[PDB]
Design a protein around this nucleic acid. Structure first.
Ligand code: MG
Lengths: 536, 110
RNA sequence: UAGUCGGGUGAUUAGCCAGACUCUAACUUAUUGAACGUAUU
DNA sequence: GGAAGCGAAAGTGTCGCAACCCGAGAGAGGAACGATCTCGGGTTGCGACACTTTCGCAACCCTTAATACGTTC
């Protein structure tokens, strides 16, 4: 109508799409939708930025599990959830993953269904209303500032049923699906990495049926919690084989075989006609696949391989190189780890688990963003539980910075209990989870203290409520006691203070921080007393 | 199954006739109907239900008529929520009831 | 026996009384339209 | 007819298990090596069940109705 036309010309994506669907100026509306999704600019740092960003803004949980009512505001870039009560933290990530299942389902199939809330486990046990709600609001540029979705479930036997409200999510996912069908676009990545990602590696890898090469394999088990590192390895070996081979040589060889078979049928051998028809079909299929590959605007296998290799080596500190070796009629992925060439099964658990996360994520981003110069600059939402899992302090100090550098437009929602990780993150990104004895909280608060660039010891005390020295060790209190003894006299070493000083010296050593502090205390108190005498 | 579904949930869905097996093989019309009337006292002498299905392939599709079942089941459900009432039992025991027993298998589902 | 029909009574959609019927076998429905009854004209 | 959300019905694919095979290795009897038993890695077939697809219940009442009271369709 004229109203839709005005709104569409004003930049409203849904109105433009509705006009496109009714008329199917059809070309103009299609172009407007496609430009809304694809337009973007390269910033001063050389990073591509979409003009219309996609992220989760807000989440509300009503009578869900232990929560009566909980509201969370999320940052566009990075949100970190902290707290001792780690079972509630995981509940929050589960709620988000279920919501994201609705986008994935509808990008894959018209009328796709995402996941539903459980009547048994998701409804709070003492809920008066006997239903549960998970409400989410997404943002997609100024044209679509609010995309609300609600997942709901009522108890059995209630007077009224509580149904989910998913139409806005489906409408948006439909735009992505339909526009992509006509003309390839870049698509959003959704992924969940739970503690399940720590699992051992099956060294034996499965024969390539060729599901892994299909673009929408990027959405396979993406919200399951462990990634699919096995799928990566299969896909990566596949890429290697194609790079070493020529593409269309099989077509040229098949073309030659069909030509040879055609000559035989022309020479009077009618018995081989059935075989010719089969080979012609194979040739047509190969050309079609080639054409579809050509039509799908996908990156060359060589380029795909290179992108992923770079990503892995950049993010995973111990890995400098990754490649496929053809040995013993069996393809093996090898890595240079800490300067030495090893198989994946020879890596440490910390290295393997982190490698698996990054490899999985990069594979999916490459598959879903074929039109970007750097496919890892694509859009998406990634959930990571216990990011510090298996990581040494040195890696904890770099992990968030490395991830954000490799995937600059992903919205990361993470959980941690690491002060070292928190030292690299702004307090605005931090949400603290301090529930009551009933496990129930209303809002999640940012800490008072700035964490980014702060000392770890301060974060421990001010944010995580942990003393810098272990309270259950006597020696941890000696310097405090020593100070008290000095203050109880004028500030002179009495017999008691001297004994303790000697104990500190004996235990911690002559050049210990503890002893230096004691020495400092003596010196300052002596100087205070001298001042006092001069004044008297 | 339509009464049970609607006692459990407002607008619950009961079961359906099979389009593969339940239509009579040599029926000239390619659909089946199962029509039932229930009685619930002199204040509700007739609760008619019809389940219908057209054969697989057929272009015309025959609709079920289940609203009376839903209407009655709504009364049971709503009245019960305000003040507890006794509810009707519906059960089928077919020849599938003869099964091996297993104490070790437990249902962790509800 | 049960179900059904219904003459009466009953501050009356109940209850009670009387009489009767029985193909395997009623389940009381829908307007502003149409038709029928009543009113108005 | 059939919105939007939902689940029944029916077909397909995945995946973990159990059974089995094989070569390696320590080393019984007393000098001649290697008997017997177990480790550890791999292959195969099976079947339970997770995933996928399709159907179908029935909102709304289209710009467009009349209004004395009843009954029927
Ligand atoms: Mg009338």
């Amino acid at each position: 109508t004229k109203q839709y036309e005005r709104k569409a010309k004003g930049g409203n994506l849904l109105s433009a799409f509705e006009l496109y669907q009714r008329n199917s100026l059809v070309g103009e509306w299609f172009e407007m939708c496609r430009d809304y999704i694809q337009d973007g600019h390269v910033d001063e740092s050389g990073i591509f930025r979409p003009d219309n960003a996609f992220y989760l803004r807000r989440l509300t949980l009503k009578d869900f599990r232990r929560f009566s009512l909980l509201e969370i505001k999320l940052e566009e870039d990075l949100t970190v959830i902290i707290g001792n009560n780690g079972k509630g933290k995981t509940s929050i990530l589960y709620a988000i993953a279920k919501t994201l299942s609705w986008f994935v389902a509808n990008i894959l199939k018209e009328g796709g269904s995402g996941q539903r809330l459980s009547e048994m486990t998701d409804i709070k046990n003492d809920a008066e209303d006997r239903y549960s709600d998970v409400s989410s609001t997404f943002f997609f540029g100024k044209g679509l500032k609010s995309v609300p979705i609600r997942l709901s479930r009522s108890a059995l036997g209630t007077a009224e049923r509580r149904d989910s409200e998913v139409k806005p999510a489906k409408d948006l996912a439909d735009i992505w699906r339909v526009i992509n069908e006509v003309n390839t676009i870049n698509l959003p990545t959704f992924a969940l990495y739970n503690v399940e990602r720590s699992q051992p590696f099956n060294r034996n890898i499965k024969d390539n049926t060729g599901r892994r090469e299909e673009r929408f394999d990027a959405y396979s088990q993406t919200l399951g919690g462990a990634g699919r590192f096995d799928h990566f390895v299969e896909w990566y070996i596949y890429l290697h084989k194609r790079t070493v081979s020529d593409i269309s040589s099989s077509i040229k060889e098949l073309e030659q075989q069909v030509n040879d078979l055609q000559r035989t049928v022309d020479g009077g051998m009618v018995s081989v006609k059935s075989l010719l028809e089969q080979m012609k079909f194979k040739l047509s299929e190969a050309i079609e696949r080639n054409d579809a590959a050509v039509s799908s605007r996908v990156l060359t296998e060589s380029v795909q391989k290179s992108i992923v290799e770079k990503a892995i080596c950049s993010v995973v500190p111990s890995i400098s190189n990754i490649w496929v070796e053809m040995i013993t009629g069996s393809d093996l992925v090898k890595v240079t780890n800490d300067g030495h060439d090893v198989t994946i099964d020879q890596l440490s658990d910390g290295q393997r688990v982190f490698l698996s996360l990054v490899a999985d994520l990069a594979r999916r981003m490459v598959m879903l963003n074929p039109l970007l110069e750097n496919p890892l600059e694509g859009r998406g939402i990634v959930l990571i539980d216990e990011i510090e899992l298996h990581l040494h302090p040195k890696w904890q100090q770099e992990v968030i910075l490395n991830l954000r550098s490799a995937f600059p437009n992903i919205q990361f929602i993470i959980t941690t209990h690491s002060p070292i990780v928190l030292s690299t993150i702004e307090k605005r990104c931090i949400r603290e989870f301090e529930p009551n004895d009933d496990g129930d909280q209303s809002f999640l608060d940012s800490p008072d203290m700035q964490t980014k660039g702060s000392e770890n010891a301060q974060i421990l005390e001010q944010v995580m409520n942990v003393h810098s020295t272990p309270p259950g060790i006597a020696e941890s209190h000696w310097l405090g006691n020593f100070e008290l003894l000095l203050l109880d006299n004028s500030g002179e070493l009495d017999n008691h203070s001297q004994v303790l000083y000697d104990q500190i010296k004996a235990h911690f050593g002559i050049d210990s921080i503890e002893l230096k502090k004691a020495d400092s205390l003596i010196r300052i108190n002596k100087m205070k007393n001298k001042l006092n005498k001069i004044r008297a």
